[PDB]
RNA sequence: GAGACCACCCGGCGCGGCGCUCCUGUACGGCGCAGAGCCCUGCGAUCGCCUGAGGGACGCGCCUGCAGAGCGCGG
RNA sequence: GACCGCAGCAGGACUCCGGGGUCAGCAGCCUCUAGCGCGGGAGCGAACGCGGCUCAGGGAAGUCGGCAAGCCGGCUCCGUAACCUCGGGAAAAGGAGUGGCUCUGACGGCGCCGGGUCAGAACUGGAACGGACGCGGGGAUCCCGACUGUUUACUAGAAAC
């Protein structure tokens, strides 16, 4: 018989099989389109979660209850250390897809990429790229690569390793990614710009811009095995129900006679791979700048680290990146940000007027220690 | 009047809110709400701002008793956030018995009412004498 | 910033953190946190907690 | 060889039924005593199990400081691990006291 | 940061301290020209002061201290 | 603790003696004496189940039915309706107080010397007090059987007998 009443089915049968993500960190797959004749640039970076803030802000958004008035936002900081380009790959369009015209590595490779060829470094051969050193380090080996891909590749795309040791967390592997170089007005233009990139470090700044939307790539905080009722988000049964009434109670019909893929079924939780689009980019800015989270209405020091410090992160070193809004995935889990694909198109002007520096570790309500340390007396 | 901000909606059907206008009306029962498209198994949820379909109670005068009337919550109890970060509660949930017109029954409302009411119902401005 | 006040802490509560109440009384209570807000509603005394800063008005800690 | 050295009693027991404090504790004693003194096998003096279960089965005492002495030769190697009693848990890490 | 077990991500871990911050709400004790009173010159629930104290922490920073990377297995 | 149930079976099976505190209690909650640590141990801290605890705002809209939970509850003093076979209803319904200290009255057997109840007052305390425990939610109706009893051991406790 029919369903009686008409409910929609719960969850999203896209994002199936909900497995843990095999890739060990946030992956790219598919980078923003090349835009031939734009200006050269580098799609991507790799940061890692730090953690949220609140930030007041003036709306500009003409047609809205908030035009011309104050706005509190959750943002989210992601410290994103300098990654250093290790590498060129230049890959062909063939009739089987995108393959690789072969990978042009640096010289002189540094030594938290090395870590991350080993699975234990003090107990290793260090064996890695030796051949390739004595090869190269004239520079004319690495020449000939980069014209072999100026002659065969279509699409440029940079090597480049996050510096472990400026980032808080306990890892000194360097994590590598391809960030594809985009705004070419041929491949050799982009091959050059690569070539200047070369064993150089590569700043947030120089590849985000304020105002900019992302697309924030990660794997989402890990609830282990759970219940329909908490995996799929099923109505828990009523509370006469014998045997227990967190699960689905139906799990199909007599026909088909095997439960299907659609139908509700208990497993993994969390550690997802997903991608959160269109995420605005509230600042890009250094912790190393003293006046970083300072504004015209703060008239105090105010950096990024929260009072307290941040909440299982750490102390953000250097470089920053804002973002307005939530990004999947816990702190100090690698989030990979890329040009937005598709940008919400009317996105409102940003201008901060106060971010939250108070303790996230309790309730703060300093903003700063030397307040504190006044209150106190 | 106006487009509103979602808000915390905490009056679910069968909510009894005081009645805050000199209507005669003590207590405003809640049959309904104005504007609500419905999932299965969700009572309709009412914030402040919103046309209610309510019933005077016992309590209130007879001949505005068993009849169906349109009301606008200008309290409520729940903790909302406005998007200018602030979060905001009432002592009690109330209302004040308003046409779809926005005309009000009674000439007066004794008490606070919430922005949110007000901005969205002029004639809740007007009568306000506090609008926190 | 603009910074209120708690209505029982006595203590500057900074942008975004904290609750407002109003009461019949037409009169808005601006609250640090919920510890500051239950204390009001249990109707516990500011002058007998020691922390608010009432208190510390009253014995001269902060006078 | 002497060492003083502090145990958390109350770290240990964290994450464990609250019944089973007093047994859990005595078991985390012996294998932090097996990391600290490098000895496979641990004696506890009566002492420290008196400590211990001073406050029951369910609440164990914050911290304990413990005066393990390294004991017995070729591969009869062991540690007799006495309480020791101290005012107050303040500056005080581990002491490799003991010379030789 | 990940988990039924596994696996995954990382690894000279980690334990105990010192700061910072935060939680609770002003520690024991001493003192007082506080205390209803009483009967004794003693008792006494309480109160103030020292004391936004004391105690705590699983968050951040640091180490001043013990430490910590198999001649284990494959290969 | 050895009896009888296949068993050293969370199953039954007759009596005798019966301390202390809190309390109206042989209640509940701790303990002296005496007995004693039960067909096993660790690790982990998933889903789910079971035995609980709490939950914003609303308050039965859930459901066949408020099933289950929750509310109420000790004592003292107020204050109690219809109806009635005048006995009841009735703890009707509802309210208010309650801790600790420091005192003041009563009440026997006097010089003496016992009492442990019942009042009353100050002073105190995050606006707290039957602070655990023990411990009615209540009101308006209708049907049926007057009632206390009794019953299908092992699916019907009923309006049946």
Known sequence: SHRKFSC????????????????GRGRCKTFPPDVQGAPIHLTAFLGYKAGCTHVMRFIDHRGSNLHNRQAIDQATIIDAPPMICTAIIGYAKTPKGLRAVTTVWAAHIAEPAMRRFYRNYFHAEKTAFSTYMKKAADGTYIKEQLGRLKQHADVIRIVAH???????????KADIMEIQVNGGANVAEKVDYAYALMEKPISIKDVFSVGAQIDTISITRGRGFEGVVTRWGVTRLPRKTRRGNRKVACIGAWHPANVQYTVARAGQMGYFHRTDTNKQVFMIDTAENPRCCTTEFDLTDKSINPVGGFVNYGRVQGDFIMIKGTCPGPKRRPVVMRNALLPHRNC?????????????????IFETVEERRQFYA | IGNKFRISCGLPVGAVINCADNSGAKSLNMIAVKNWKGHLNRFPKASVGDMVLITVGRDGKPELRRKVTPAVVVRQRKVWRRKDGVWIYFQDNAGVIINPKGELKGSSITGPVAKEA???????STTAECVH | PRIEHCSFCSKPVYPGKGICFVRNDSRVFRFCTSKCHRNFKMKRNPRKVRWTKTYRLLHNKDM | ??????????????????????????????????????????????????????????????????????????????????????????????????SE
């Open chain 1, 348 to 364: 409102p002007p940003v201008q901060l007027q106060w971010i939250s520096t108070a303790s996230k570790f309790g309730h703060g």
């Open chain 1, 162 to 172: 996050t510096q472990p040791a400026l980032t808080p967390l306990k890892q000194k």
């Open chain 2, 118 to 124: 007000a901005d969205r119902w002029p004639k809740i």
């Open chain 4, 1 to 98: 060889i002497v060492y003083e050295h502090t145990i958390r009693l109350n770290k240990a027991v964290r994450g464990k039924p609250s019944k089973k404090a007093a047994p859990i504790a005595i078991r985390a004693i012996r294998a932090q005593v097996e990391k600290l003194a490098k000895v496979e096998d641990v004696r506890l003096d009566p002492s420290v199990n008196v400590f211990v279960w001073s406050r029951g089965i369910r609440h164990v005492p914050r911290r304990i400081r413990l005066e393990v002495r390294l004991e017995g030769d070729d591969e009869h190697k062991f540690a007799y691990v006495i309480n020791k009693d101290v005012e107050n848990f303040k500056h005080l890490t581990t002491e490799k006291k003991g």
């Open chain 1, 8 to 23: 929609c089915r719960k969850g999203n049968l896209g994002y199936l099989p909900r497995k843990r993500c095999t890739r």
